[PDB]
């Protein structure tokens, strides 16, 4: 009777950064996921755990989604069990994800916004973001936080611009997290 | 700052060596690290990186033979082989890497070992009196950013070190007399003032793209 938000969270404006990503969450509604496996502009739709051609039946609690920006070349990165540079220091998905991811295209419609954490001394946790900003003292020297020798910022800027950048186009990546079973369910198929 | 290096030997095919890469003045736990080969006469390669989380990386070419740690207790850098091949001997450098802020501040002293995208840089010798302006040109065989691309220079046994990081951007230490440009696919490389000094072999290399690719390799000559 109230599709369920996912135009807008699929389709708008802004999107956030890498190293700082929204999570957005839905409460109450039916959730027909018909558009899903529908558009072709859903390059990858790649699906784990829960049968992708069918998610109709299934009666989750709540669905959380967020949004990125990756440089296209690390899209396949985005996966369970990946390690490099985003996946240990930006982003972790943990063993047994329950959901979909999606990555797009979209370079046409979108620099030097965009910019991701580069230097930490330990990975993240499954589900877990960091908004710090704090020179990590990278020689055994005390770092006073001035940009220095051995001193250097944990976030860099990224570079978009309309080459070719076939692994650089800038990509738009957001994936689906299903929850388990705890109260009754408000959101099924039909 | 100081990096230093302990190992070396002759060794049959198949059999086995480490070699050790001590720091001083640089914690080695919370900052990246890379091991390189240079082969006898061919040029550069890239063998492994280690991530200060903990994670490791390998060579495509090359993976199953060595193997690299990280050590914490003495500031060092241990890395493993399995066995060797005719094919595998060569001089050994370790660096420490920074992905943009420069690409590798320091370098080792090298370590000699022995058995019992693409990159092309145009001028090729470029035999030229003193005085006369040098330029060098390395090509990309793919499109790539304006950033993401160094310049090393390699004295006649010496360490390689970096004149010009992250496309025009110089690192500390260098004269003014190096400035290179980027346009399109084509990155160049300008000497000015030229002095008797500077005999050595220019190289060209790219980061972040892929397993890192160094260029074949050119000798200015005086």
């Known amino acids: 009777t109230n599709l369920c938000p996912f135009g807008e969270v699929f389709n708008a404006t802004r999107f956030a950064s890498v190293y700082a990503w929204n999570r957005k969450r839905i409460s109450n509604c039916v959730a027909d996921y018909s558009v899903l496996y529908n558009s072709a502009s859903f390059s990858t739709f790649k699906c784990y755990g829960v049968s992708p051609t069918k998610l109709n039946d299934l009666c989750f609690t709540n669905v959380y989604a967020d949004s990125f920006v990756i440089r296209g070349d690390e899209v396949r990165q985005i996966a369970p069990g990946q390690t490099g540079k985003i996946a240990d220091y930006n982003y972790k998905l943990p063993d047994d994800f329950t959901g979909c991811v999606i990555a797009w295209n979209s370079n046409n419609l979108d620099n030097y916004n965009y910019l991701y954490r580069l230097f930490r001394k330990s990975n993240l946790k499954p589900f877990e973001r960091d908004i710090s900003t704090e020179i990590y003292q990278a020689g055994s020297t005390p770092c006073n936080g001035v940009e220095g020798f051995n001193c250097y910022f944990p976030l860099q800027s990224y570079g978009f611009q309309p080459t070719n950048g076939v692994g650089y186009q800038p990509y738009r990546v957001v994936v689906l997290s299903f929850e388990l079973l705890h109260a009754p369910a408000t959101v099924c198929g039909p | 700052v100081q990096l230093l290096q302990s190992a070396g030997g002759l060794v049959q095919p198949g059999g086995s060596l480490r070699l050790s890469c001590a720091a001083s003045?640089?914690?080695?736990?919370?900052?990246?690290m890379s091991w390189v080969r240079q082969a006898p006469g061919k040029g550069l390669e890239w063998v492994s990186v280690?991530?200060?989380?903990?994670?490791?990386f390998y060579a495509d070419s090359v993976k199953g033979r060595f193997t690299i740690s990280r050590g914490n207790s003495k500031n060092t850098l241990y890395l493993q082989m399995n066995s060797l091949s005719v094919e595998d001997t060569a001089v050994y450098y370790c660096?420490?890497?920074?992905?943009?802020?420069?690409?590798?501040?320091?370098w080792g002293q090298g370590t000699l070992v022995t058995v019992s995208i693409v990159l092309t840089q145009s001028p090729g010798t470029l035999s030229l009196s003193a005085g006369e302006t040098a330029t060098l040109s390395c090509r990309a065989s793919?499109?790539?950013?304006?950033?993401?691309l160094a310049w090393y220079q390699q004295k006649p046994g010496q360490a390689p070190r970096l004149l010009i990081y992250?496309?025009?951007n110089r690192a500390a230490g260098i004269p003014d007399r190096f400035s290179g440009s980027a346009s399109g696919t084509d990155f160049t490389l300008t000497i000015s003032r030229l002095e008797a000094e500077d005999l050595a072999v220019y190289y060209c290399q790219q980061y972040g793209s892929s397993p890192y690719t160094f260029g074949q390799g050119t000798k200015v000559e005086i």
């Open positions: 003045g640089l914690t080695v736990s919370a900052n990246y």
């Open positions: 660096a420490r890497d920074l992905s943009v802020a420069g690409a590798f501040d320091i």
């Open positions: 280690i991530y200060p989380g903990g994670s490791t």
């Open positions: 992250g496309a025009s």
């Open positions: 793919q499109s790539i950013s304006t950033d993401y």
